[PDB]
């Protein structure tokens, strides 16, 4: 009945979780900043010759919704952890997301990818190396992406699927 994968996209407010997701789904770049509460998307796609159904939970970065987090990290099979490369604070918050996920699912081996978004912007303030170092300490791949430009977008989501498959 085709394999289904529950992906969750988490990260600080404004980093571009929704922009990344809607780019993947619709090949469209959302230019407005509308704060998400809880959105859901489905996508049938062939990865590595196998057809699968992606279930993408797009979540709220705004701190006002921090209580509703546990609620989705339970279901989720794999996580996109997104920060923006021009937002040092969004990078620092990542550690908290990773730690909460590990906690809730009670495992060290939880499929996730570290996404550094907005890499089309030249005003970079988080260094690739800094993020790459964090990725390895987590034992997870680091992918830089631009939801505006499409760079890395498929690479990030589909890499996550590959991780969930091997898990």
């Amino acid at each position: 009945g085709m394999t289904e994968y529950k992906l969750v996209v988490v990260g600080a407010g404004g980093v571009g979780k929704s922009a990344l997701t809607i780019q993947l789904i619709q090949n469209h770049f959302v230019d407005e900043y509308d704060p998400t509460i809880e959105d859901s998307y489905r996508k049938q796609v062939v990865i590595d010759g196998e057809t699968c159904l992606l279930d993408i939970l797009d979540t709220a970065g705004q701190e006002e919704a921090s209580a509703m987090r546990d609620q989705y990290m339970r279901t989720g099979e794999g996580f996109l952890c997104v920060f923006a490369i021009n937002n040092t604070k969004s990078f620092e918050d990542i550690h908290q997301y990773r730690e909460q996920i590990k906690r809730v699912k009670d495992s060290d081996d939880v499929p996730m990818v570290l996404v550094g978004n907005k890499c089309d912007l030249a005003a970079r303030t988080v260094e690739s190396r800094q993020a790459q170092d964090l990725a390895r300490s987590y034992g997870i791949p680091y992918i830089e992406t631009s939801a505006k430009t499409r760079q890395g977008v498929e690479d990030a989501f589909y890499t996550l699927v590959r991780e969930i498959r091997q898990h």
Binding site: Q26, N27, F29, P35, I37, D39, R150
Partner: protein
């Protein structure tokens, strides 16, 4: 646990019972709701414990069968005004000692009940406005009420979302780029050269470009169909032209193109030329298959299966062996109630253009073969499993609607196909009769011998094939 308000000040605090909510047996693992009262349904639509954004879609898509839009708005506004609890004993004691209360319980209920429930009410509001805006166009008092509601929401907690929804409502009142990594292939030309729209026809346009432009055209038509044209089986009712104009525009395009394929075949009276014509059409079928244009595939298969075309045994004796094989594979998609088609669809890598007919039949039978309500203990529960089934169908549809085709529009070929009118001024019976007669004329029944007819095409009949070229 955690205490709730009184069921006498807040209707959505009524305890779950088999007289107000029934769960499906199986299980994430969140409960799946089988039936419930409207009150209970709306409570779960905005439950505090867990997320279910799929439930938001199901509900907003199908609610009008059991609850009016104004009633819905009233009940969510009601749901949103949760009364705060009175200070506890610990709290009372501190206030009479001149201290600040710890307000532990109040702070918990705010963070673990009020905040999630209000956020999810606003979520229903965002989606209702973003994706089901038609309720508001057809009832402006409803839009006023929503605008007022959002605009009276105070509290810094909800500040960011209130501003956002206000902006979205405003965009929708007064009214879509695509980005590809890759660049689209080059538009392909045959005998008819660019600009020469007078010469465009089935044989003179490049068969590759015919499939592509029809696929862009048909994809666009598929993507325009809203779930409002689907829920309630309204496309089969008296006012179908009012409620389902996009669905009908699209079915109508399909029927024209099928009848055009038929007409092209049976109006080519010379056997050899007709063979070229049938052949080219099967070539177009092949490019359709490549593009995952399943609506287009069926257009051709229906044409071939039609009464005046199916009987032309002399024409199909002369089709290349490879092409018999293609028409057979394609026809077989529809055998056993579209078994192989459904398998293929759920297995390809989109973009694709599904065949919309399967969906219409399933939605209709779903609406017709399940009860609106379930009676338990004298009470009437809304039968929600019926509604979830319809939503899984509208969901499938919406899902295939996202991925766009990486192909260049050629405006003149696009216009040519948008204006295609095989039936002319004739009614469907008299045109259908004509086609069948022409079929009798060109290949009579046994045992009448097969006549000969003069050629009609001045240009070359050789197909340029279905393999794309590539200069630069």
């Amino acid at each position: 646990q955690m205490r709730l308000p009184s069921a006498d000040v807040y209707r959505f605090a009524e305890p779950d019972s088999e007289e107000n909510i029934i769960f499906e047996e199986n299980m994430a693992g969140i409960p799946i709701i089988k039936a419930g009262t409207v009150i209970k349904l709306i409570e779960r639509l905005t439950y505090h414990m867990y997320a279910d954004p799929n439930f938001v879609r199901t509900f907003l898509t199908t609610y009008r069968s059991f609850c009016k839009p104004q009633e819905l708005l009233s009940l969510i506004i009601e749901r949103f005004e949760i009364p705060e609890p009175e200070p506890t004993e610990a709290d009372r004691i501190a206030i009479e000692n001149g201290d600040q209360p710890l307000s532990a319980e109040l702070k918990r209920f705010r963070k673990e009940y009020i905040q999630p429930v209000q956020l999810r009410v606003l979520n229903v509001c965002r989606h209702w406005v973003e994706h089901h805006f038609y309720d508001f166009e057809r009832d402006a008092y409803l839009l006023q009420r929503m605008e007022e509601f959002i605009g009276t929401v105070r509290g810094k907690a909800m500040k960011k979302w209130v501003e956002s929804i206000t902006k979205i409502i405003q965009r929708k009142k007064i009214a879509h780029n695509i980005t590809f990594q890759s660049s689209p292939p080059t538009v392909e030309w045959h005998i008819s050269r660019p600009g020469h729209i007078e010469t465009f026809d089935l044989l003179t346009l490049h068969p590759i470009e015919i499939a592509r432009q029809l696929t862009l055209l048909e994809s666009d038509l598929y993507r325009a169909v809203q779930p409002s044209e689907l829920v309630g089986s309204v496309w089969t009712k008296e006012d179908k032209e009012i409620n389902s104009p996009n669905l009908l525009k699209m079915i109508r395009h399909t029927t024209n193109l099928t009848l055009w394929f038929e007409k092209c075949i049976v109006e080519t009276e010379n056997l050899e030329e007709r063979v070229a014509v049938v052949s080219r059409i099967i070539e177009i079928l092949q490019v359709f298959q490549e593009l995952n244009n399943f609506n287009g595939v069926l257009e051709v298969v229906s044409a071939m299966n039609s009464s005046p075309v199916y009987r032309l045994d002399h024409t199909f004796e002369q089709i290349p062996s490879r092409q018999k094989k293609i028409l057979e594979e394609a026809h077989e998609l529809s055998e056993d109630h579209y078994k192989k088609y459904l398998a293929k669809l759920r297995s390809i890598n989109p973009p694709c253009v599904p065949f919309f007919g399967i969906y219409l039949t399933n939605i209709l039978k779903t609406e017709e073969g399940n009860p609106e309500v379930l009676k338990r203990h004298g009470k009437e529960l809304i039968n929600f499993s019926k509604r979830r089934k319809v939503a899984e169908i509208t969901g499938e549809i919406q899902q295939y609607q996202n991925q766009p085709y990486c192909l260049r529009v050629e405006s003149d070929i696009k216009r040519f196909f948008e204006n295609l009118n095989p039936m002319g001024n004739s009614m469907e019976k008299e045109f259908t009769d004509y086609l069948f007669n022409k079929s009798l004329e060109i290949e009579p029944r046994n045992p009448k011998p097969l006549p000969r007819f003069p050629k009609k095409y001045s240009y070359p009949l050789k197909s340029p094939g279905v393999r794309p070229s590539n200069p630069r």
